[PDB]
Symmetry: D2
Subunit: 250 residues, 4 copies
């Protein structure tokens, strides 16, 4: 019951890491809102999770669209109660170095990751600040802390999220709202993870970047997020928490 009486909205919550966060949050007694670009997916996943009295509801919204994400958060609050937590998990990845990157793809990557974190937080902060109570978890990556070959836009976007997290902590920590970023290492099993992988030598070069000797699971990342959401993390704010199997330590 680490999240007893918490109400948590999770963007990109219909699949992958976001869904695992939802599962773990329900385990700890939270009520959860899954907000996804894919409304049907959010609804199906919410139903799948709604067992043993667990309360999970699905909502459709593109985080880059101010009116849509605002309406989704308002509806979540109307449906399951005033938010105590927001997880800005929605993100997309793509490839392209600065010299040849698709400019339109660049903008979309920056939009979903950075603008989405901005707009979703903006919607949630009205109530959280009014209540002097909230916790926001943003999604960095190892790709926001170091450079990754061939991922210019994504490294820019995640770098933005890491420092935006510090900025938001600066504004809001004293007003009762903690803001932190989890920075995951590679997680193989998700759609994005599969996109990333998509030769014994190449993948092995990648695996060699991880002292722990394996890549992450959605469940590994979810546990870190649940800690940050919980009131046991009451003094934790502005942190960029590396959950990365040692990648950024070497």
């Amino acid at each position: 019951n680490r999240l007893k009486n918490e109400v948590i909205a999770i963007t990109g919550g219909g699949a992958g890491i976001g869904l695992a966060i939802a599962s773990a949050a329900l385990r700890e007694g939270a009520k959860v809102a899954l907000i996804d670009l894919d409304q049907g997916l959010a609804e199906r996943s919410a139903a799948m999770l709604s067992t043993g009295g667990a309360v999970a509801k699905g909502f459709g919204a593109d985080v880059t669209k101010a009116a849509d994400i605002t309406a989704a958060i308002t509806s979540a609050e109307q449906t399951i109660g005033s938010l105590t937590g927001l997880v800005n998990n929605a993100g997309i990845a793509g490839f392209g170095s600065v010299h040849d990157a698709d400019a339109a793809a660049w903008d979309r990557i920056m939009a979903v990751n950075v603008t989405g974190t901005f707009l979703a937080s903006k919607a949630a902060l009205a109530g959280m600040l009014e209540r002097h109570k909230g916790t926001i978890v943003n999604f960095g990556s190892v790709a926001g802390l170091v450079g990754i070959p061939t991922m210019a836009a994504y490294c820019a976007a995640k770098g933005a999220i890491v420092n935006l997290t510090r900025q938001m902590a600066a504004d809001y920590s004293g007003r009762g709202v903690r803001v932190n970023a989890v920075c995951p290492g590679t997680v193989t099993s998700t759609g994005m993870g599969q996109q990333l992988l998509g030769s014994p030598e190449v993948q092995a070069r990648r695996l060699a970047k991880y002292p722990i000797g394996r890549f992450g699971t959605p469940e590994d990342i979810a546990e870190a997020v649940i800690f940050l959401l919980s009131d046991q993390a009451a003094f934790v704010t502005g942190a960029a928490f590396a959950v990365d199997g040692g990648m950024t330590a070497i």
Copy 2:
């Protein structure tokens, strides 16, 4: 659940943050060994904690003395079982800038913090590596990540611990032993906290903390309990700031 079947040794566990870690670890089902310079204190604190079937044991050792810390860990394991976790919480602080610091006090601060982390870990690692299973939590500080006026030796020591943690993670993460550092902001209530305090200046210190308050031993303990737990299975080499936003600004 969350530390069911864990066996945790905590250096400097007789008081302050170390004692809070012990209490929280017992809450989560671990068995704990308090290892403190002050043997009597370790014993009294262990006795106080050992209620409701909670198992805590106290041992005396100076972490800077290789034979003594090795013996305490051996005794702990005989009494509560093979270690699954080590918290290198033992540390001391002091004041003095580079131009005027006393060399002997400098050496003692470096010894307790850095050499203690080295020797305690060395002792624990024999067993942990043999079993391919362990978690070590070292104690950095905000003082290991940024410069603090008038605390040269302490900033050096905590800076050493932060990067030694990365180095240890590099060596051992693939061999079944995770190594992480908690980097706490100021916690005023402990013996060390009271030492650092000893009002315009207080208010200036408080303004360094976006959250608007200093930390408690319980705040820090919860982060340590997370890092010790198998729910942190992918977390290694991290320098985790538990600091009310201090290093974020």
Copy 3:
């Protein structure tokens, strides 16, 4: 003559830190192209700088407009020779926290800073990679390393630039192109510096800000320019992927 035979393009080169970089680069023997949103300013400043044999030329371009910045770099190269260095100095700042920031303002700050760095680098990289030779200096800030109250978009943009610099260094350092970021502390005398002051008039906050700087003063455009000159020079041949704090100690405490 630390930049003899170098040809450097400087975005936002018409005024402020960019103009100070131009002046120092000319001192060290480079030829410089000033590229600024304000074409007249770029041209007037280039004229002012072109004394004693120094060669500076001005060009107008909005760094957020791919065709415009590409055209400016092309004209610059036709005028003063193939680029060996690019300084992505153009940037704008503004105020607003996540809860109240205007989305359009947010986008423009992200565009000039992040998209501008992307688009100008893209233009310069074609030639630099072909020649296996270049150095790119991006502009972070203390605001790209730590959080600054009430500057959400700007902290996001500068944070993007700091890590984009790492990413570009990862791609290009082995191909002959070094990429680094200078992260200046507050420089009061520029238009942006004045913009920052003007945003809070109290002298408690004014002295509060200065107390963040161990060195006991704010930066000058000349202070920042010297670090950029070092990074552009071949004396910095092993320096790449660095986020170099030039900040009077601000991020050290």
Copy 4:
């Protein structure tokens, strides 16, 4: 003339990166004191550098011995003038992990690196603070910023130096003394580079595609020592071919 009117003491100045710093500082018009554990080497290297009117002098001291290093700095100041810069270049490396490192070996690595930086700085700071003018460059490493397998003591020592640099800058920047740390990537050609010389695995960690040279590192130190770096203090400057960027 970037260091004209500067007087710079360089610990470990008899060889390797230290000697390269001396050479570049003399190129820029500074007067240099080489301070080395090997006194004869400091003297011979100083003599070699002292051509074309350049002023370099050699002195012997173990930076871990307070009286030794204090006496060398005092002798230096008496011979070439009051210090304006100090480069804490002296350092040693070794191998050993936490589980197997010998405690005496651990202590000597910490001593030369960390205690040496403390003691040499303590000696120089008396004069620098009196004159409200100084610049101190400490030696970190990529090994002070990230973990390096099998180098526990060395990663601890360099980690200490990186944050001690921030601490010193906090204390002294407003009093006229800048303090910075250079953090070099691997430099193969020095005694330490050779000592620490799978090898293709190591090179792959460097995006620039080569290891550093003593000259590469010297140029960064020269910048940090110069008055052109007037606003630079408290910084950990990575000179590392991109190693810590990935």
